[PDB]
């Protein structure tokens, strides 16, 4: 389906303050809370701070670059049910499904005209 | 346990583990011998054994003195480690024998193409200090591996 152009207000991730100087400090985001903290004050040279405002347009939120919406499945029944709106939703097979089940699921999906994002996996 | 791998498939190899010799001195000796022909390497090691040539130190050199035999090598430091020389000569002889017999190669075309020295766990003793204190007195062994082959290039 046609859609609006997707815009990402920020391309990089929000890194935690001072996580490049210590291994013990992981890069996952935390809010700075010190009395003298320079990133709490937001002086000119510091890195950006998380806030509502960077939020994505809700017309294209959660949309993959291909233009589909992701739907994770693990059984052939899960595929047949809840895929009448095949226009916007694509299927993704879960990590733990084996090769035999993957064969069966791919045959059924090809019969039903549903897109599969990870179709090449476990094919050697 | 070998850190060296390749398709040359015409290489002799040998190794020893938990060698009871200083790791730093052995590292220096192995780095010095690298890239030489085997015959020249034997001559060089025997010369180091009686202070005719020197082993230049490129990595662990803080207390190593300056000597005139090191002139023209890239550094002004060096020493004459004997335990390391004996060990390295043994391992090199074994590798040469493995190459010659397995691939029937002769000794005039063999070169020292690779080496690796790794730290190992040592024996722990103790020493006594003033005011009734006790400290440690450990050793610093190593693992050694040497590879001989046709030629670097």
């Amino acid at each position: 389906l046609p859609h609006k152009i997707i815009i990402k207000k920020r391309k990089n991730k929000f890194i935690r303050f001072q996580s490049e100087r210590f291994v013990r400090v992981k890069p996952s985001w935390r809010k700075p809370r010190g009395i003298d903290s320079p990133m709490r004050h937001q002086y000119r040279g510091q890195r950006p701070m998380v806030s509502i405002g960077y939020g994505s347009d809700k017309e294209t939120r959660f949309m993959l670059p291909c233009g589909f919406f992701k739907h994770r499945i693990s059984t052939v029944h899960e595929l047949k049910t809840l895929f009448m709106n095949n226009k916007t939703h694509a299927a993704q097979i879960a990590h733990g499904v084996s090769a035999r089940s993957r064969k069966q699921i791919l045959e059924e999906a090809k019969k039903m005209g549903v897109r599969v994002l990870n179709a090449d996996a476990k094919l050697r | 346990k070998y850190a060296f791998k390749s398709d040359n498939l015409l290489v002799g190899k040998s190794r020893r583990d938990g060698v009871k010799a200083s790791f730093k001195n052995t590292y220096s000796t192995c780095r010095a011998i690298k890239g030489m022909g085997v015959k020249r390497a034997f001559a060089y090691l025997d010369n180091v054994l009686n202070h005719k040539e020197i082993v230049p130190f490129f990595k662990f050199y803080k207390g190593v003195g300056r000597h005139s035999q090191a002139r023209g090598s890239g550094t002004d430091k060096g020493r004459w480690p004997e335990k390391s020389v004996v060990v390295v000569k043994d391992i090199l002889k074994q590798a040469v024998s493995n190459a010659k017999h397995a691939h029937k190669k002769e000794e005039d075309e063999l070169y020292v193409i690779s080496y690796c020295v790794n730290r190992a766990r040592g024996r722990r003793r103790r020493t006594f200090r003033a005011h009734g204190r006790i400290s440690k007195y450990e050793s610093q062994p190593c693992h050694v591996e040497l590879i001989v082959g046709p030629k670097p290039l």
Partner: protein, 122 residues
């Protein structure tokens, strides 16, 4: 480089970014044109195609002149892609003739977000 082969031009120089003593705006480049000494004379050269040569690739990067800067004949320019700092002090060409590069001289923001409500098809 042959797209601009044998095209006469008026020489110019790229003297740095638009800036203050606190912030820098690399979207805009300041250019000095030979023979222009006044704001009005710059008004005589507004909206013309220019180019600069990347010392490595050799390919020319195109842009346009936008508006004056100051009182003494400097101008502001925008390029197809923003310029690195290594080009500061090089030469730019203000072509006498008219070329049709298509969209080779349009900045990236205008290219991608000309209208925010555009549609992608399949």
């Amino acid at each position: 480089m042959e797209e601009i082969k044998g095209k006469t031009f008026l020489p110019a120089i790229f003297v740095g970014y638009q800036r203050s003593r606190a912030k820098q705006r690399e979207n805009v480049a300041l250019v000095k044109v030979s023979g222009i000494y006044t704001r009005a004379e710059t008004d005589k050269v507004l909206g013309r195609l220019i180019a600069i040569i990347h010392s490595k690739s050799g390919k020319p990067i195109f842009g346009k002149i936008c508006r004056p800067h100051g009182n003494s004949g400097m101008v502001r320019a925008r390029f197809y892609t923003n310029l690195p700092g290594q080009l500061m002090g090089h030469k730019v060409r203000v072509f006498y003739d008219n070329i049709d590069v298509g969209d080779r001289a349009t900045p990236k923001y205008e290219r991608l977000y000309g209208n925010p409500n555009a549609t992608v098809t399949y």
